[PDB]
Amino acid sequence: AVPATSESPVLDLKRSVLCRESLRGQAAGRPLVASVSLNVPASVRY
């Protein structure tokens, strides 16, 4: 029922990274998980 963290498009120009403060959190630390739904946008986790 609830919309996701990030609304997903194809062909949409990538969101940039410029500093340490925005880049931390990104380094993968656990294996991938993928969810698909009826209501919620599709997400891929570390």
Binding site: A1, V2, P3, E7, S8, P9, V10, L11, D12, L13, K14, R15, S16, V17, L18, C19, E21, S22, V36, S37, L38, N39, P41, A42
Partner: protein, 441 residues
Amino acid sequence: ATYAQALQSVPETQVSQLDNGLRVASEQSSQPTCTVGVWIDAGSRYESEKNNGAGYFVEHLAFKGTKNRPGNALEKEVESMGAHLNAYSTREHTAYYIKALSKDLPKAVELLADIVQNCSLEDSQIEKERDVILQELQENDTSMRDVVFNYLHATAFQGTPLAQSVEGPSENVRKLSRADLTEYLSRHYKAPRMVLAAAGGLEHRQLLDLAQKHFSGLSGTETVPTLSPCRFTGSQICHREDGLPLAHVAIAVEGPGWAHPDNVALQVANAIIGHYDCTYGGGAHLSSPLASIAATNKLCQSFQTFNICYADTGLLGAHFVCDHMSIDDMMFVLQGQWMRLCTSATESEVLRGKNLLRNALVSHLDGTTPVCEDIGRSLLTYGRRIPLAEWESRIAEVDARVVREVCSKYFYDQCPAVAGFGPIEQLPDYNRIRSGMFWLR
């Protein structure tokens, strides 16, 4: 044991105020973990033009040391006890909160207090965090969603404090002295403007006494900051930039603001129209006519309805991302939906909307953090936590007639604010958009 019943035995929220005026609020349940934090009536709305982005600048400096714990001492202590420390700033609400083990709640409350009150704001640390903000500002330019919404506010509430971005202009970021920041803090961070919220395994009694121990020093006493109303303007902002591959459009009418009961019926209506993107399982068979039409005809890549609430006003509408040839058709079906709900919403579809909304806010409040946040912010917006049993009362009251009458108040024959960014050549002219806010029948 039914749903109606289940709501009756949801843990109540405890409510108490300190001598200075700081509220302590807390929802309890035997849980090994907890979330606690401080919510403040402070943000960009409370900033003037010359001190815009100060609250954001502060947020950067918050976790960079205190008088009691200089530099990375505050940082080290949070990490080593397995605690998670986090912050956010909206146009009206700044908030700092910590996720910790239930046994570590005393130290958790202590650390929050140390952050708020005794924040270092070092000369070197300011000049460091200055470049950081400037780079985030550049990153933010590459988020079309962020840009279009900032534009919506900027045009909707033009010439007021609500037009202002949370981050502030690069001009202010480059100039803001430590004098500005400390002056901003002592003006806005006051006990009656703040709420200490916690959820998880916490005895309410203990939290309130910990609040005494560390938050007693908070000031609660000329020209007390009281936000003026903000003038909505029917306007358009069009950032045409054909170099970007997809167009972002954000459109809204004036919403009622936090207080108003109509917000419940508006949520029901917004749930009917709902949201969509290209990764959704539903496609053609989706219940929302906008979504099924959008899926079958590849109109947009994504859309959501949003009813953004501020104090005496807000933004009620939708955002979409679509192909450069689809903007006109997207606008057509979306405005078509607003009109259909205003004029001719059905009982069964409103019931669907109700059921969506019931489900929406029951499952959002799952885990200590979102429950802590609901406590913190509800105290700021409503002046209390509204129990789930009461939300349910308000939802059950909404029928087809209500949805019509409520939607007709805000949407029907009203001037919207439009923001567009990207290859927006097709994006309908304001007059055509304005004419799309009524039907001739």
